[PDB]
Amino acid sequence: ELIVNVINGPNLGRLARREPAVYGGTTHDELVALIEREAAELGLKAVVRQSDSEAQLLDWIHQAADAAEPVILNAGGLTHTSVALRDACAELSAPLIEVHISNVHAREEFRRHSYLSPIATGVIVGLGIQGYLLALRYLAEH
Amino acid sequence: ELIVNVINGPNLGRLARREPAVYGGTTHDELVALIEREAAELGLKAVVRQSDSEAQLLDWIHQAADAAEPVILNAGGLTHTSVALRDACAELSAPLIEVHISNVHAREEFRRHSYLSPIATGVIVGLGIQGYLLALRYLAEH
Amino acid sequence: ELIVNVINGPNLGRLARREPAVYGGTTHDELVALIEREAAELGLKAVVRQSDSEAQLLDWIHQAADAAEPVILNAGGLTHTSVALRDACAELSAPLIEVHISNVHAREEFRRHSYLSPIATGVIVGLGIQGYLLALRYLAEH
Amino acid sequence: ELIVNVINGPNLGRLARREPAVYGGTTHDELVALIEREAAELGLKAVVRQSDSEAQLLDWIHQAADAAEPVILNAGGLTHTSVALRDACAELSAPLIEVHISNVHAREEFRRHSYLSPIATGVIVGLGIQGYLLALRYLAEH
Amino acid sequence: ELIVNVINGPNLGRLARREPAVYGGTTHDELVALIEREAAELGLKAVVRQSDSEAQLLDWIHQAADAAEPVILNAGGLTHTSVALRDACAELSAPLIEVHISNVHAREEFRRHSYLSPIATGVIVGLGIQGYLLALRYLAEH
Amino acid sequence: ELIVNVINGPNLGRLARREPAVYGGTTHDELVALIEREAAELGLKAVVRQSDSEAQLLDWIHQAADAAEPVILNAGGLTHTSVALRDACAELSAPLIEVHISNVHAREEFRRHSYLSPIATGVIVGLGIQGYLLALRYLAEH
Amino acid sequence: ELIVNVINGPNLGRLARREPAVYGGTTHDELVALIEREAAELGLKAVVRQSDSEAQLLDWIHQAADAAEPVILNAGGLTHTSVALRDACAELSAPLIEVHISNVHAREEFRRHSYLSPIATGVIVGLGIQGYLLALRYLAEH
Amino acid sequence: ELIVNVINGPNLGRLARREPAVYGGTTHDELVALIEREAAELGLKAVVRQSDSEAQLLDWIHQAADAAEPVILNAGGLTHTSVALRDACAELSAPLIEVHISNVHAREEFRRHSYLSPIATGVIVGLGIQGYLLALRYLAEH
Amino acid sequence: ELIVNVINGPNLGRLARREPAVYGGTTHDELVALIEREAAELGLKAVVRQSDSEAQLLDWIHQAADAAEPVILNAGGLTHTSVALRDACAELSAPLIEVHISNVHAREEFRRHSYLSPIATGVIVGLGIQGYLLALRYLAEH
Amino acid sequence: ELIVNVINGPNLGRLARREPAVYGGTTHDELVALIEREAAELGLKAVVRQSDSEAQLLDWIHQAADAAEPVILNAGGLTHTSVALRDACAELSAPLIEVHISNVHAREEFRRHSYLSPIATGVIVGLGIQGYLLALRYLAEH
Amino acid sequence: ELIVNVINGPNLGRLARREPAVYGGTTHDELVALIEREAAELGLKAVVRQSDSEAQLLDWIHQAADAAEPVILNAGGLTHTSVALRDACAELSAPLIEVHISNVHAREEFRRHSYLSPIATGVIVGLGIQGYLLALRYLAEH
Amino acid sequence: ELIVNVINGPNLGRLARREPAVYGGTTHDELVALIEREAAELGLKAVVRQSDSEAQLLDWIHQAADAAEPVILNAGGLTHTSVALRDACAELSAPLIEVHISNVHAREEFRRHSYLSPIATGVIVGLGIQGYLLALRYLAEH
Numbered sequence A, B, C, D, E, F, G, H, I, J, K, L: 001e002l003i004v005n006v007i008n009g010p011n012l013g014r015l016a017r018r019e020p021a022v023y024g025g026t027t028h029d030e031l032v033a034l035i036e037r038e039a040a041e042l043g044l045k046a047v048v049r050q051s052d053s054e055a056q057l058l059d060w061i062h063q064a065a066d067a068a069e070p071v072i073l074n075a076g077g078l079t080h081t082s083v084a085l086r087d088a089c090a091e092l093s094a095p096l097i098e099v100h101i102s103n104v105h106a107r108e109e110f111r112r113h114s115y116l117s118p119i120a121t122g123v124i125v126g127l128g129i130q131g132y133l134l135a136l137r138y139l140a141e142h
């Protein structure tokens, strides 16, 4: 606060228009609108970005580390697979909240391990799109 | 909503007055006050209970299943150990949110498995006492 | 024989009125009636008890060990989790039959390990409420 | 009911005359007599067969699937080892009960995994020869 | 080529008339017709055999090793369980293709290990009955 | 059919000119020619693409999901490592066939696990370059 | 010192009168006498309690944490199973000694893992009833 | 002694004429001649049989158990896979020696586990055809 | 020699200016200067590149394979995670040395497995920035 | 009693003068003095030896087995690694107590397995130098 | 042949006079006599040595490698634990036979892994003292 | 610097004259010459010792700890097996570099775990004899 970095990884540009049983009927742009409006009332700025590239995501983390600005991260598949991501996050001085739209713990046994959690401030899973909004509100207090 | 069952398990009566490095400087009673005030503004009732007994906790879940009222659960150690708890929760018709005050994923490798998660709606870990408050607010929307 | 201890653990007071896809449409009291009537014709006494408390169950086992009277045990979740139970049973001089209402082997991989089996006389799973009745009838022969 | 297929696998022709510490002093033929007499009073027909051949056993299962007649199976060693058996059973429309004469759970750790259980109706272990008789009686109710 | 050995293991005589959700509505004989007709146009002979016996299958492999003729193998359950089979195949001078009608990788975790694959030329799973036909056509090129 | 998406992942631009013990003496362009000619006679269009980038591959899958057009995927190393890929594929409405040029099961034990298989229609491994051609022909039937 | 909390868990009220091959011919009350007399000569007070309830034990630990008084713990089965216990102990400011009457390491492989050890001062196993007495004497020095 | 049962399992009829890198250039019949001649000088009878059928092998073991005559067993693949075999052997009153022609411990990691060893008198691996002859000579002493 | 490819992966552009407890106070550019000066005296050319992109790194390896020029690789997180990298390296005709700035073996247990090592010439870990310089000097001899 | 063999393994000659955070400020010779004085009052003889050689230690055990005299063993690293030691101890007719100066269970996960425990009378860990003294006193009773 | 190195490891000097349930009533010297007499008739020299020291054993292997003379090895505990031994043996040009007096496979699960087997010619276990004699006789043929 | 302890473990006296495929054609003495000459130019003293005894090696480490002089360690097999070594090294105040002549990571899966690495400064594997020389040069800088 004021500035709050919201980051989505691979596939998360496909929200709503594809799925929506599993990650909900809300499109990406609509999500940016949701976050931006909730940051308004909270008196925060939400810089909300999405990418299907690990190097892009990496860069955004690098920048957040530098600017010492907090992050909210939905890294998609890279959550379970990337050590490069984890280690970039590890550097962040500001809090990092890990967010999952679906409950990870009620799926394939592999989706239950996370490289991000151990170095996150805390995690939200399965509360859907609202996970982002609840994460925001946390940061506005701390 | 209106009625929201908030449940803490073993040891969680010792909040603040003991620790507070790990689970924070906020006492139990103060937590009940926090929750009760946040439920006020939200237009919910928070029935917040704590017990060091598995049979007691079981009973409270039974009642919540019956009344079809939502639960927020910080089951302490029973999270990693009790199948009896998990299965009582499994019955709940209303949403169940699993809450951890400390980040479970940044501790002993054993604290990372949960019998509750797979059948929870979703989970919050490491956001501290606020985890309860963010959980509440979820339920008020859904 | 004559005296046969029938014991149910956690959650098993909720039979029929809750579930009944998984553990059947038969309530607890109705089960006591079923057992008591089958013991009648067999010329046995069925002392059938249920508790959601490990210390209670423990006590009933202690008493059965002392009285050297047989046990039929549906320990619910404690089957997979409690070493305290297992060891109390281990003491029983009389036969112990382990009973599961649902087939344990057709569920979560964790439900397939039992602390009770290795020291039971034998086990019945998935034959539903009748498991108790078939267990009884065994004891009446041996 | 009326027709109930009782099947024993490898080595089970050696009952009583060999062992009898572990699987009891009752010979195979005597077991057929026991089952046939219990089916009499129950008003069932017991077609009780034994083979040391997987292809033979397979064939008998095939036939039972076809005739939609229930099975009681003591598959000996093939219980822990054969996927071919499991899958033939999987096809059966009628209930299948898995029977073990000795308690499997009180022996070598390997004897504790079963390919049959997950797709059985239910299982009986360690109740000795009576396991067959209790299984029968189940089927006569359902 | 010309001569191509097509071999099915346990249960695979039950094709179509039983299942057909999982392994398809095509009967065994119809499959022989399918293969024989595809070998016609390809200018190959298809010797297509099925057995529920490991010793029979073994013998057919022995003969194929001797005649140095290629094999297409759907060994059913023996795929995951038999080292005797694997080792007989290992001897084959000609290519061996492993065929599965259902996708093995989308089922029980145990169905995912194969004793045959490591010493096969290659494998086809989940393409249904056509797996055989595509395997044939391979052999006609190499 | 008509339109069939053929996709190769990392390193697969190096075909023939490098290796060729392991993945064969056929160059990439020659492979496109092979596929394009086989699609000709089949009356299909083969859109055959290769990339060493996960985001690129992701995008091509996204497009195929959208256009509801089938995919043939040789994802190279990402087969064993990427959950992001798997999940993009999971979305595809049309069949997906997983193709490996080398037999994966006859190499390092790690090359034997696949994130793609469980959600593929079926898989071809070790039939070399022809795997693509046999996959095509499948799709032309279904 | 002066005040030394001695705590036994589940089943440990059955000492001597039941067993005594495994945990010895000495009854509970006799053990209290033994400890109380050894504390006499040492110039300590031994407050020796036993319970079959986890909540009771929990409470006694809570009190010991508060009073900053040392503990000697024979938690029976809860040693291998309870994280709730472990964490209550973790809080104790004073030394905690873990005591086992039987050698845990010469039994079932499961009895060899302890949730208590990692946060104990030290452990005594297999020295029988004397383990308590040797533990006492330690505390009297430190 | 006098009578010594020598048994080979699956594939072992193919000795010499096929392989011979791995299990040696000596044919089966030649092996029978070797054994029969060594039993001559030793003053034993060697009844040497081979089968590719588990039921056949089973039967021969049954007979040996009955006649209380010793066995030398090269069970091929069934060594690593069959519990039915192991248990038939378990019954033998006379010594059983397990024989492997190739060193099992210098091959695939799976070939290193044996169901037979734990209940054998002792084992010989990798000494080639002579393993049989050395086994014989043992029995002639004991 | 003369030409030596030095490659850094993800995050390694952040050297010195960020960290420096763990990977040292030396910036990337300063590292290029260090390497370039050491190659001077050695009579080698150091082409030192860094990228946060797997496809970029892949390309540089491809080129090195082609030019048959040696590589020194600090692949960051991709060391533990990428099979695509490993396999591109596998192709290199020239020696590859794997370099880690921090000791990998004194950190998280996951950082201890490497996809690169098995196909490297050799590895240097924990000797800090000098690892690169010692690697260079190796290549100048061989 | 009278004669009590006290044995230390590798590195344990370095006590006090090196460490002393972990195994305490007490030197070896001082430990011999401590033990010798405690054996005085107890009316025992303490023959206390230390060696960094497995063959030496072996020999001392051999002698103790022969003389049927009890042992107290701090085998250092050989505790977790040597089967030769374990088996020499296994022979001892007299009690063996296993002693660890540091709590083994609060360190590296590998330090938690012991080859000695299963065949010890009992074990003391983490009670520091006093572990030896408490062990002595045990032996003086039994 | 002529010269055959027979080597025993740790504890094996204690044969007969200690045990003899497990490794037999035959003393070491008597074993040397047995071997020396059997080598006589065979026309071999048996150089039979025993040591409780790894460096000694190492040296004897070194010498055997040098002299290219065969070895028979009973390495006691070092069989399951030493890589140093294994690797010294690995060097031997002549055959190495691994000998165990007791059946290793019928004991603790840990005694079943051997560092020696994979690089032995072959192994004998459980044939008692005669294992040595049968090993000798092998070498005299090859 | 000046004084640098170079230590080789078991079998490493056999360098060059035996092997040399795997650890190179350079004899031990020649290695001492190599190291001594490289230390000359560096202005260091190399005290280079080798032993096949764990107690000897232990002693040399003890001395190095005492003298606070750096170590370079090629511990041969003890690398994967000895906790006694690891712990002696752990004490060293000066840097310790772990050196392997062969690439450990390209061999048996067991050779890939090291007790030494976690407490080393850093490690060199597979750079052959030069590993020692590069290690030296490191120490001369730090």
Ligand SMILES: O=C(O)c1cc(O)c(O)c(Oc2cccc([N+](=O)[O-])c2)c1
Residues within 6 Å of the ligand: A010, A011, A012, A013, A014, A015, A016, A018, A019, A023, A074, A076, A077, A079, A099, A100, A101, A102, A103, A104, A111, F083, F084, F087, F088, F091
């Ligand atoms: O936020 C999550 O809970 C989540 C977790 C995962 O493991 C994903 O791969 C993941 O990413 C996907 C994967 C496939 C499709 C979509 N999508 O169509 O929004 C998103 C999201």
Ligand SMILES: O=C(O)c1cc(O)c(O)c(Oc2cccc([N+](=O)[O-])c2)c1
Residues within 6 Å of the ligand: B010, B011, B012, B013, B014, B015, B016, B018, B019, B023, B074, B076, B077, B079, B099, B100, B101, B102, B103, B104, B111, G083, G084, G087, G088, G091
């Ligand atoms: O909410 C959590 O994050 C939490 C997680 C756990 O695994 C606990 O055992 C746990 O319970 C404890 C354990 C020990 C002490 C206290 N306390 O003094 O508040 C609470 C809490």
Ligand SMILES: O=C(O)c1cc(O)c(O)c(Oc2cccc([N+](=O)[O-])c2)c1
Residues within 6 Å of the ligand: B083, B084, B087, B088, B091, C010, C011, C012, C013, C014, C015, C016, C018, C019, C023, C074, C076, C077, C079, C099, C100, C101, C102, C103, C104, C111
């Ligand atoms: O008898 C069984 O097969 C059984 C097995 C289990 O693992 C249970 O947790 C178990 O207990 C439950 C759990 C949840 C709900 C009920 N119930 O509503 O009867 C019973 C029963």
Ligand SMILES: O=C(O)c1cc(O)c(O)c(Oc2cccc([N+](=O)[O-])c2)c1
Residues within 6 Å of the ligand: D010, D011, D012, D013, D014, D015, D016, D018, D019, D023, D074, D076, D077, D079, D099, D100, D101, D102, D103, D104, D111, H083, H084, H087, H088, H091
């Ligand atoms: O019914 C059982 O409990 C049972 C379980 C098993 O794992 C058997 O192998 C098994 O089969 C055997 C094995 C060896 C001997 C006999 N028999 O002499 O009856 C039967 C039976």
Ligand SMILES: O=C(O)c1cc(O)c(O)c(Oc2cccc([N+](=O)[O-])c2)c1
Residues within 6 Å of the ligand: D083, D084, D087, D088, D091, E010, E011, E012, E013, E014, E015, E016, E018, E019, E023, E074, E076, E077, E079, E099, E100, E101, E102, E103, E104, E111
């Ligand atoms: O070809 C396969 O994909 C396949 C794989 C398996 O694991 C089988 O057990 C298997 O065999 C069965 C098993 C049960 C029933 C039938 N069938 O009724 O055709 C076939 C087939």
Ligand SMILES: O=C(O)c1cc(O)c(O)c(Oc2cccc([N+](=O)[O-])c2)c1
Residues within 6 Å of the ligand: F010, F011, F012, F013, F014, F015, F016, F018, F019, F023, F074, F076, F077, F079, F099, F100, F101, F102, F103, F104, F111, I083, I084, I087, I088, I091
């Ligand atoms: O299609 C396969 O069977 C395959 C499987 C893999 O695991 C690959 O990494 C893989 O990709 C590579 C890896 C290295 C080199 C090449 N190439 O020079 O064609 C291709 C291909």
Ligand SMILES: O=C(O)c1cc(O)c(O)c(Oc2cccc([N+](=O)[O-])c2)c1
Residues within 6 Å of the ligand: C083, C084, C087, C088, C091, G010, G011, G012, G013, G014, G015, G016, G018, G019, G023, G074, G076, G077, G079, G099, G100, G101, G102, G103, G104, G111
């Ligand atoms: O102190 C021990 O060594 C001990 C260890 C355990 O794992 C117990 O379950 C345990 O508790 C029991 C269990 C069953 C019976 C009795 N008892 O009759 O004293 C005590 C005691």
Ligand SMILES: O=C(O)c1cc(O)c(O)c(Oc2cccc([N+](=O)[O-])c2)c1
Residues within 6 Å of the ligand: E083, E084, E087, E088, E091, H010, H011, H012, H013, H014, H015, H016, H018, H019, H023, H074, H076, H077, H079, H099, H100, H101, H102, H103, H104, H111
């Ligand atoms: O005696 C052995 O060492 C042995 C061990 C095995 O694991 C076999 O499968 C085995 O059986 C085979 C397998 C394939 C071929 C032959 N054969 O051509 O003699 C024999 C033999």
Ligand SMILES: O=C(O)c1cc(O)c(O)c(Oc2cccc([N+](=O)[O-])c2)c1
Residues within 6 Å of the ligand: A083, A084, A087, A088, A091, I010, I011, I012, I013, I014, I015, I016, I018, I019, I023, I074, I076, I077, I079, I099, I100, I101, I102, I103, I104, I111
């Ligand atoms: O060279 C290494 O020892 C090393 C090993 C790793 O596992 C890395 O992730 C790794 O990459 C990182 C990760 C996070 C931050 C930095 N950095 O600020 O230089 C570099 C480097």
Ligand SMILES: O=C(O)c1cc(O)c(O)c(Oc2cccc([N+](=O)[O-])c2)c1
Residues within 6 Å of the ligand: J010, J011, J012, J013, J014, J015, J016, J018, J019, J023, J074, J076, J077, J079, J099, J100, J101, J102, J103, J104, J111, L083, L084, L087, L088, L091
């Ligand atoms: O008694 C123990 O608790 C103990 C346990 C261990 O695992 C040791 O390696 C061990 O040995 C060491 C190891 C390193 C240094 C010393 N020392 O300087 O006394 C002693 C001692």
Ligand SMILES: O=C(O)c1cc(O)c(O)c(Oc2cccc([N+](=O)[O-])c2)c1
Residues within 6 Å of the ligand: J083, J084, J087, J088, J091, K010, K011, K012, K013, K014, K015, K016, K018, K019, K023, K074, K076, K077, K079, K099, K100, K101, K102, K103, K104, K111
């Ligand atoms: O030859 C064997 O079968 C054998 C196997 C082992 O694992 C031993 O530790 C072993 O060594 C011992 C161990 C303890 C005692 C004796 N002994 O009194 O002859 C010998 C021997």
Ligand SMILES: O=C(O)c1cc(O)c(O)c(Oc2cccc([N+](=O)[O-])c2)c1
Residues within 6 Å of the ligand: K083, K084, K087, K088, K091, L010, L011, L012, L013, L014, L015, L016, L018, L019, L023, L074, L076, L077, L079, L099, L100, L101, L102, L103, L104, L111
């Ligand atoms: O430095 C190494 O890379 C190395 C690694 C190991 O695991 C050894 O056992 C090892 O020791 C041996 C083993 C067998 C033979 C020799 N040698 O003839 O030099 C040396 C050396």
Ligand SMILES: [Cl-]
Residues within 6 Å of the ligand: A123, A125, B123, B125
């Ligand atoms: Cl979580």
Ligand SMILES: [Cl-]
Residues within 6 Å of the ligand: C123, C125, D123, D125
């Ligand atoms: Cl069961």
Ligand SMILES: [Cl-]
Residues within 6 Å of the ligand: E123, E125, F123, F125
């Ligand atoms: Cl596959």
Ligand SMILES: [Cl-]
Residues within 6 Å of the ligand: G123, G125, J123, J125
């Ligand atoms: Cl312990």
